[PDB]
Structure formats: C-alpha cells, structure tokens
Ligand binder design. Structure first.
Ligand SMILES: Oc1ccc(-c2ccn[nH]2)cc1-c1nc(N[C@H]2CCNC2)c2ccccc2n1
Ligand SMILES: Oc1ccc(-c2ccn[nH]2)cc1-c1nc(N[C@H]2CCNC2)c2ccccc2n1
Lengths: 287, 287
C-alpha cells in the first residue's frame, strides 16, 4: 500500500514510465500530477530534491511535494506528452524544425544548469519530457539523480599553498580542470544527432569498431542518404558538439549563437508556448 | 573565554603549535592532553573527526573528546616530542637510521589509511608528530582535515550502462582512475628526501626553473656532496617514490618491501617502543 500521508493528499493512478512514475490526482485541486517513486539511494534523491527545489526554469521540471517513507515519493508537475525517446525510436524521424524547437529549449535548460553550478550528467531522450501531445510543445529536463554540484574546489585550495610536497599529477590536472560541464554538451550533441537522423552516432550495429573506440576517436557513423535530407547548418552544430577535446567542444552559449538557432520563427513559437503555459497562473500587474 | 563544557573537564594551558593547539590537563586523571582549536570549516572538521573516531593504529593520532561550540575543540593524546618539521629545518640532519625508524612508521600509517579507503593529501613534516623528546620514539600522523574517503565511484556506476551518450573524456579517465592514493606516496618521497639530506628536492633556491616545472618533470635538486654521506639503498627508495607517473610510482607495500627497510634492528626498536607505550594500558590475558 501507499503511505497514509501520500494518500491523504492524492489519489494514485496508472503507471506512466520507468525507479517508477505514476499518474495521480491532487485532492485539493482535482488536477493531474506525476509521482516519482524511488525504492530504498538517499544521496541521489536528496540532491535531486535539493536541486529541483532551488531551480526555477520553464524547461526544468518543478517539484510539487515530497514523501520520505517506506519508499521515496516525489510529486512533480505532469508531462502529458511523454518521453522524447518515444519520438525517436524505431528510426522515427523528427522534422528538422521540430528538432530545432526542442533542442533550443534543451540548450536554454542546460545553459541555466551550468550558470547555476549544476551538471546533469545523464542527458538522453528518456530524460527529456514533452509537455503535451502537440508537436509544438514545451520540453522539460528531468532525472537529476546523477547530477553534480560545482563548488570551491579542493584543487583551488591546494593551489593556494606552495607545492613543495604536492604530486606532479595534481599540477597537471590544472590544465583541464573546470570543464566537467562539457560532458553535458557532448550528450546534447548525441541527442541532436539522433533527433535529426533517426539513428545513434555511436553504436555497435554493423561495425567491427568497439563502441568505446568510436567515442574516443570521435568517429560517428555518417550515413549520407539519411543526412542528405537534413540541413547543413544543423549537421555543422552537431559537429561542433561532438568534439573529443572537452576544451574545444562547443559550450551551450556557443551553441545558442550558432547560425542554426538564429531562427526568429522558432523563438516566436517558443515564446508563444511560454505565455500560453503561464496564462492560467498570471496575476495582474501594476501598469 | 573557553566554553563551559570544555572547562568543566579540562584545565587549559600554554600553546604548542599552529588552527591552533594548546596543552591541557584532564581533571579526572590529571594527565596532559592536547586540544586542537579550529575557528568558525565544518566539513574538514566533521571528516577528520569521523575519520579519527573510526581509525585505530599506533602511528595515527587518536581523538579523546570533541566540543562543538563558539569554536571547534578537538581533544587529542599529547605528543611531547613536537613536529618532525623542527628536526629538519635549518638544514638540520637526521641520522640515516633515525630516518629509517621514522619513515617506516610513516609507511605503516599511510598503508593503513590506504587499506581503509582514506587518502591524507597533506603529508609534510609539520603533520608528523614525535611521541617524546627521545630520538627513538613513536611518530603519529595528524591533521586529517584535507583527507578524502574513497567510495563506490560515480565512474564505476557510469561504466555499468552503455556509453551511447557518454563523453570521450570520461572513458579516457578510466585508464588512470583509482590512483589518487599515489599522491600520498609522492609526499612521503619528498618527506624522506628532506629527512635524509636536510634540504627540499623541489625548491626555488638558486634555480631559474619554476617550482611547477621541477615537479612535473620530476627533476629534483641532487647535491652529491650532501648525498654522498647517505646510503645508496635510501636514495634508491627515494627515487622510486619520486616517480612522475602515478601508476609506476611505488605504493606503500612496495616501499615496505624495499631493501632499505629490510632492517631487523630497526623493526625491533619499533616493536620495543610499541609495547613500551602500551605497558600502562595492558590488561591481563587468558594464558
Ligand atoms: O511527468 C513527469 C514529471 C517529472 C518527472 C521527473 C522529474 C525528475 N525525475 N523524473 C518525470 C515524469 C515522467 N517520466 C516519464 N518517464 C521517465 C523515465 C526516466 N525519465 C522520465 C514518463 C514516461 C511516459 C509518460 C510520462 C512520463 N512522465
Ligand atoms: O600533540 C598533538 C596531538 C594531535 C594533533 C592533531 C591531530 C589532528 N590534528 N592535529 C596535534 C598535536 C600537536 N600539533 C602540533 N602542531 C601542529 C601543526 C599542524 N600539525 C601539527 C604541535 C606542535 C608542537 C608541539 C606539539 C604539537 N602537538
């Protein structure tokens, strides 16, 4: 059975995705919510919760309530459209302009995370949710269990004294330090590739090259027939995200200023979707 | 003034070293103790405390009591002999056999830390204490503020899925992962060098080469005149600890099985010092 405190406030309903996620209705409002159930662990949950509570962005999922019981119960706003994954499996093809709308929201979200010292670390189609079944909708990033919070490094502190006793490898690590966030940009790269093309850039399907070797070499599977129907600006951005060198890799800022996203129509549709979401919540304002 | 709870149990006394460390007497026993005062921070203290409470080794400092107040008060067993630092400053020279006795205890201590998933990260003469003013005494490692606890890596967890979305640099980091403890072995290397020779291997004294460059290149300042009076087994062990490559660097096990420490006299003197320390604490045993 469900905890009594949960039951007090919500009627539980069907399962939505896989911990697990159920549909529920909040008694007070009769409105639909999502409830994420994480079995008993605590670190991932405590951080996701601490993160989502402090974060505030249209393309980051918001937490509504939390229950610490025989299991963990996280109450989130519901995403009716489901996983981006479902839109790209079975070589299903997202039309390029839809890719742009989605990816643009993904970039803003991840930019926001990074501005705020958060690295997601597990970005993939499964963790990107669509706000409705419309093809033009808002997307929100979820599943912050694996994320990491940047902070005043032990490295920084170490650099404040004299390295009389300090090992060589620590000093060498200084060259590459502070680029952990770049792992999110690689992931977005892969996600964008998949969205545009309907297939994964790195894969074991019909290769003798190991997955590991394709990834470290940076050599994605380029299928001209499929990519031919895709713009050259799009593929160019993909190429700047799939850069092996983390220091050379495009950041979110560079991605956002890339020509492929200089698209005033797209930004309009997004702004449209925004105020539309917010219509029901808007208080009157001093004019 | 000192907190009332501290005062209740101890009479505070003179300062010993620099947070700060004072001499004190425990009222119950009239015995001397050391009290480490750390101003207000909490992470270093909570970890040192959590570490020292769970650790149990003749060459690791033991905690006696703790006070969480306007400041942090840690009550440790007193080390009458002071810092190893004082024995090596002003080009003062430790006689080789004393070096061996001390370093051997240092190796056991740090081996113990490593067996137990602890990395010290701040080993230097200042953090090595002598148990008495005798030249043949026990040493104990202190100052565990900067230490790190090894645990089930986020890296390990990441390796359990498919890296479809996983950045190249994470995969590359696998080659070198799990050798963080080697930074302690470098430090011991430097400490041993200084003990044997009376001077630092890496230094800005009379060089145009940057400190950073000497360390990453591995090129210590070798002064034959000073080292001539030093055994060749000793210098050999030093050389195996000052290895730039962390994977090639001697571990504590390798250091302990190095010929320079195959010295039955030395181990005897150490065992002697042990049972001697413990004489006052020994309960009778079933024979
Ligand atoms: O509607 C939601 C609201 C919030 C969250 C969420 C926030 C933080 N973690 N999960 C998830 C859902 C959510 N999650 C789903 N599947 C998972 C698989 C792992 N990635 C998402 C899902 C799947 C199908 C339909 C609706 C869904 N709604
Ligand atoms: O007698 C002690 C017992 C325990 C500890 C300790 C344990 C954990 N942190 N510090 C230190 C002392 C201790 N510490 C000293 N100086 C510091 C400078 C930083 N490194 C040690 C010291 C210096 C002179 C004479 C006695 C001393 N006793």
């Amino acid at each position: 059975v469900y905890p009594k405190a949960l039951r007090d406030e919500y009627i539980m309903s069907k399962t939505l995705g896989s911990g697990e996620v159920k549909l529920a209705f909040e008694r007070k409002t009769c409105k639909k919510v999502a409830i994420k159930i994480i079995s008993k662990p605590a670190l991932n949950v405590e951080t996701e919760i601490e993160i989502l509570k402090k974060l505030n962005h249209p393309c980051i999922i918001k937490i509504k309530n939390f229950f610490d019981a025989e299991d963990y119960y996280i109450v989130l706003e519901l995403m009716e459209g489901g996983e981006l994954f479902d839109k790209v499996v079975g070589n299903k093809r997202l039309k390029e302009a839809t890719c742009k709308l989605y990816f643009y929201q993904m970039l803003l979200a991840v930019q926001y995370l990074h501005e705020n010292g958060i690295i997601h670390r597990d970005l993939k189609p499964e963790n990107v949710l669509l706000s409705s079944q419309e093809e033009d909708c808002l997307i929100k990033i979820t599943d912050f269990g694996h994320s990491k919070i940047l902070g005043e490094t032990s490295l920084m502190r170490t650099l404040c004294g004299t390295p009389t006793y300090l090992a060589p490898e620590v000093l060498v690590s200084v060259g590459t330090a502070g680029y952990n966030r770049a792992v999110d940009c690689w992931s977005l790269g892969v996600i964008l590739f998949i969205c545009l093309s309907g297939y994964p850039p790195f894969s074991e399907h019909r290769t003798q090259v190991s997955l590991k070797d394709q990834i470290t070499s940076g050599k994605y599977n380029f299928i001209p027939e499929v990519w031919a129907e895709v713009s050259e600006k799009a593929l160019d951005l993909v190429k700047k995200l799939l850069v092996v060198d983390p220091k050379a890799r495009f950041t979110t800022e560079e991605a956002l200023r890339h020509p492929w996203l200089q698209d005033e129509d797209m930004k309009r549709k997004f702004q449209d979707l925004l105020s539309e979401e917010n219509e029901s919540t808007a208080l009157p304002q001093v004019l």
